[model samples]
Target: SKLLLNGFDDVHFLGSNVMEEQDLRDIGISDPQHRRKLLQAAR
Candidate 1:
């Protein structure tokens, strides 16, 4: 995933409900809008 984010990682989205740990790392770019809700439940 890090490699892709290094490559042509311009814009890509992961339509998953519970995106765990490192998975949420890309949420800023994947779904900045949903990042807010994700953070709420991150606890």
Candidate 2:
């Protein structure tokens, strides 16, 4: 019944500098400042 888990099946674990603001924007985050917050959280 949980479809969200299926959404992540193709996602690989994060790596160093493998994802950046562009990637965040791709995920619907357009604010650069907010992206930084998420980046720190990821780190």
Candidate 3:
């Protein structure tokens, strides 16, 4: 129930339905429209 890019130390997408402690690290690169919702939630 989770997915997504990381080659630089710590970077990638975890599609879990929970807010991670790190700010601005919420959503993934799924749907273009969904980007806002994901980012907004994280931000």
For candidate 3, report its TM-score.
0.28
lDDT of 1 by residue, 1-43 (tens): 4686654443433324335655777766688767788788796
lDDT, model 1: 0.61
lDDT of each: 0.61, 0.66, 0.49
**Model 2 vs truth, CA RMSD:** 12.6
User: Model 2, 1-43: lDDT tens per residue?
Assistant: 8897676655643342357745866666566787789989999
Measured by lDDT, the strongest candidate is: 2
Better of 2 and 3 by lDDT: 2
Residue 29, model 2: lDDT of 58
lDDT of 1 at 39: 88
The list of candidate 2 runs beyond 4 A from truth reads 1-28
| Prediction 2 global C-alpha lDDT | 0.66
Clash number for each model? 0, 0, 0
